């Protein structure tokens, strides 16, 4: 039920502990104001600073005029912070507007196509992303929605995705969350407390080449449908050879425990841990951050499920893309398919109350 | 608050406390055969047990034959019971299959159009529900793939909603919910403490016709979106007009508090609670179990949110019915949309481990 702090060299909703649920939103900017955009930037810090700290936008969400709309939509009033972190993000469309060509990241890459891709163009890209982590899922679209409200005229939502349980881990000292394959997701990754790995695989330096983001971060996002049918009815052994771990324990194979060190020459050569495991990609290492959906049914008498897959990394072309890459021949990918694509920097963190979101670009 | 007993003479998630999360689907059935039918239920409800008891399904998820698949398929592993529920109804179209027309309750009405639905078919309608509610997500959705997997081949998902209320390890369990139109939702209901009041207004008895159905209910699902960027730019004045309480403290309008009885002549005419009240309906009383949705942004950037109506009854044509035609008028149509809908009869408990999920309509 704890504020997680909003001011920092870095955005939280990266290296903090992995909340329950997310609702992620995209957006396309609708102004050519730069100015107008800049005081959007500030005025969303403000709420992001109110919400994040259990507090409502504005004067609030009652007891102001009766014949105004409240500046606070209400439906979190009486709620604690419940962890609540707003992570933004600026996409490459965002910077063929307000002259901001030449301040385009080289790390912010498109990516490359992908064998197997069926990307949803309406479901991919943006301008702007705004990430709402919470325990509560009221928490978390109250958020959403107040900025939604106060970027009325100025931007638009152009995509969102809700993750009702999350299948990520940066707390190896708590249990593992499982995805809707059945499987631990999350063991292998980046710690919130391992600060020279974050240091190494996440953060964005000024040495890296562009200044302005020293302290953020690069996001990739991809939404990943599962092919459930398919899974179920494979046998227990084809299932933990997809993976190269055991489904109970999720140790890797030949060992008995989920946190041994995997011994890759056991696996399958096509085994998705294998694959994207940093010995087999360079060293490259990314911090995993995605939640699970289901979106109802799929028309055809199923269960839709999947994945919404985030990562981190402090260059996109030395972090998802070559373990993407790898991942050509993985086993996984017969029940899998990624059908939206997005990518993203996301700025230095709010250093404190006088600063705003995008301070160090604008 | 750790498991709520399967077995009962009523089926749990009815009068039981209101969990966080919910996962409720809708079930087409696919085989004519009334024997195959019934093994299904059976299996469910085996299943159900295990399920509400925090245990995987069958053999496990793990463990057995590595040529077969696992029973169960683990994303479960490692939760909690988390106060799961599994409540089972059967749609009016179930009973024209397998010799059960006659056997049809009279108190599942179908319902009429009302003025302003806007119904999709696709979720509209079922032979079978099971509503799956838990404090975590998971554990519903676990529970629902899982009975759908087992009954593969036999019934199909028709249509699938998630849901959430309160979270409660960080609110406390008396505080009334909001609903995302942010007013208090649920102050006066029908509390699964009052035993009499469900006698009166939730469980079918054996006197109302339908011998199968005693210590059943009838369930009336709405899913209703709501036009939140239009209720957004509305006044503070004229939201609070629209309900006949105040948003902050949710007590109707001229009193302080909350639960302070409502004098609905203070209230405008057509406010929504003067219209939903017993006393303008006759005394008619609902048990509302509804939770909220959020679905994502349509194509037009607006958000796909609302309440999944959910309202329990001993008869649709003296609960729901009447109620909903009160609010031809209600001040609150100008904000909503009924966009789907089904009614089901929920049968009895399952009385002991040797019972089963529809076993007093099989026979
Ligand atoms: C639906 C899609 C996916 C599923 C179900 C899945 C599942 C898993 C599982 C079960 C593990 C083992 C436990 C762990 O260490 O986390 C794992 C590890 C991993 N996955 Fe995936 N994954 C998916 C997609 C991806 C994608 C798209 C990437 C990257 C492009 C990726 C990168 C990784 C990495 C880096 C590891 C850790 C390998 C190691 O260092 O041991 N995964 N995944
Ligand atoms: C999105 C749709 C709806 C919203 C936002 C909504 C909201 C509310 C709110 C805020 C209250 C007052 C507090 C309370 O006592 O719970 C209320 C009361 C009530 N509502 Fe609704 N409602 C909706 C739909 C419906 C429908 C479809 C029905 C029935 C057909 C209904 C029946 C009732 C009843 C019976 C009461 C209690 C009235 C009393 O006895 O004081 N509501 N609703």
């Not at 063929?96 to 890459?109: Q, W």
């Not at 990314?286 to 897959?309: E, P």
């Not at 963190?349 to 705003?356: E, F, Q, S, Y």
């Amino acid at each position: 039920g704890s504020a997680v702090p909003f001011h920092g060299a870095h955005q939280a909703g990266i290296a903090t502990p992995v909340q329950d649920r997310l609702h992620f939103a995209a957006f396309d900017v609708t102004t050519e104001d730069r100015a107008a955009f800049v005081a959007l930037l500030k005025e969303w810090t403000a709420a992001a600073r109110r919400l994040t700290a259990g507090h409502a936008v504005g004067e609030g969400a009652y007891g102001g005029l009766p014949e105004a709309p409240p500046d606070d939509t209400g439906e979190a009033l009486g709620l604690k912070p419940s962890r609540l972190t707003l992570t933004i993000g600026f996409g490459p469309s965002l910077f063929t507007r307000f002259g901001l060509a030449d301040l385009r990241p080289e790390a912010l890459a498109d990516l490359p196509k992908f064998p197997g891709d069926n990307l949803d163009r309406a479901r991919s890209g943006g301008d702007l992303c705004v990430q709402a982590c919470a325990d509560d899922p009221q928490v978390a679209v109250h958020a959403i929605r107040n900025l939604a409200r106060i970027g009325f005229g100025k931007v638009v939502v152009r995509w969102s995705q809700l993750g009702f349980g999350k299948t990520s881990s940066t707390t190896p000292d708590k249990q593992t969350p499982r995805n809707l394959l059945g499987f631990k997701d999350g063991t292998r990754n980046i710690a919130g407390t391992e600060k020279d790995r974050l240091d190494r695989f996440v953060w964005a330096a000024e040495k890296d080449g562009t200044p302005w983001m020293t302290g953020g971060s690069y996001l990739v996002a991809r939404r990943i449908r599962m092919h459930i049918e398919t899974w179920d009815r494979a046998s227990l052994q084809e299932q933990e050879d997809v993976f190269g771990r055991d489904k109970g324990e999720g140790a890797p194979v030949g060992k008995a425990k989920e946190r041994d060190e995997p011994f890759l020459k056991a696996m399958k050569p096509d085994a998705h841990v294998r694959l994207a495991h940093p010995d087999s990609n360079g060293g490259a290492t990314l911090l995993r951050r995605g939640y699970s959906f289901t979106d109802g049914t799929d028309g055809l008498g199923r269960l839709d499920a999947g994945l919404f897959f985030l990562a981190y990394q402090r260059d996109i072309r030395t972090g998802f893309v070559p373990v993407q890459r790898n991942l050509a021949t993985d086993a996984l990918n017969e029940f899998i398919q990624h059908v939206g694509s997005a990518v993203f920097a996301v700025p230095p963190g709010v250093r404190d109350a006088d600063d705003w979101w995008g301070s160090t670009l604008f």
